[PDB]
């Protein structure tokens, strides 16, 4: 069911924060553990700020904190080009339950279209289930990221789900879960943007995990 997939997502969601060495942590959004010490996280969380690699990355797993130098996480792309969401290996994180087999297969994508879905996410660790209207797939999606200083950058990704719904700041990194029980309520991707009552999630397929 949607709710049981949501429970598996919930258990693998951590809060992602960034800070200067010896400074306060800025808690930015969610990251989703997928297997071993690998997580999915929107790279817009960190990559547009100056000297990201000299920062400390923080992972909050239910009030137990894990930190690491940004230079010591291994970042791997989901596919060619910029997809925002990346795979991130974090050697200091406790191993995750492997939830990769619960992600949609590329070939099954059409089966989630035109059906409801649920965004399984948090706002700074408080779990929320957000209804999303019948899904469409945008071959390219563009959204605006506001940086810390106030300036903005336009981001464009390939293959992003679009659904009607109401999101809030901090919900990025949550997982979109199909209402379709015939594909076992597959995880469809990762929430990256929202506005004007529409929610956008980057498609993540099982096949993408082959990038290790």
């Amino acid at each position: 069911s949607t709710l049981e997939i949501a429970g598996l997502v919930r258990k693998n969601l951590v809060q992602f924060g960034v800070g200067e060495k010896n400074g306060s942590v800025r808690w930015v959004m969610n990251a989703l553990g997928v297997k071993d010490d690998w997580l999915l996280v929107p790279s817009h969380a960190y990559k547009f700020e100056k000297d990201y690699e000299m920062m400390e990355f923080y992972f909050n797993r239910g009030g137990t904190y894990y930190s690491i130098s940004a230079g010591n996480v291994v970042i791997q792309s989901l596919d060619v080009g910029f997809q925002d969401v990346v795979l991130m290996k974090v050697p200091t994180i406790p191993k995750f339950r492997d939830i990769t087999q619960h992600f949609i297969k590329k070939g099954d994508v059409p089966r989630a279209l035109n059906r409801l879905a649920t965004l399984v996410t948090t706002v700074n660790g408080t779990p929320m289930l957000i209804s999303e209207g019948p899904l469409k797939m945008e071959e390219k999606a563009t959204y605006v990221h506001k940086k810390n200083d106030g300036t903005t950058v336009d981001l464009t990704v390939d293959q992003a789900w679009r659904g009607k719904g109401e999101g809030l700041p901090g919900m990025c990194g949550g997982a979109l879960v199909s209402s379709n029980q015939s594909i076992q309520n597959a995880i469809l991707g990762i929430h990256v943007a929202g506005g004007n009552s529409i929610l956008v999630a980057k498609l993540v397929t099982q096949e993408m995990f082959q990038n290790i």
Binding site: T142, Y143, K146, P169, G170, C172, G195, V200
Partner: peptide, 4 residues
């Protein structure tokens, strides 16, 4: 849309 804004990055969320």
């Amino acid at each position: 849309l804004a990055a969320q």
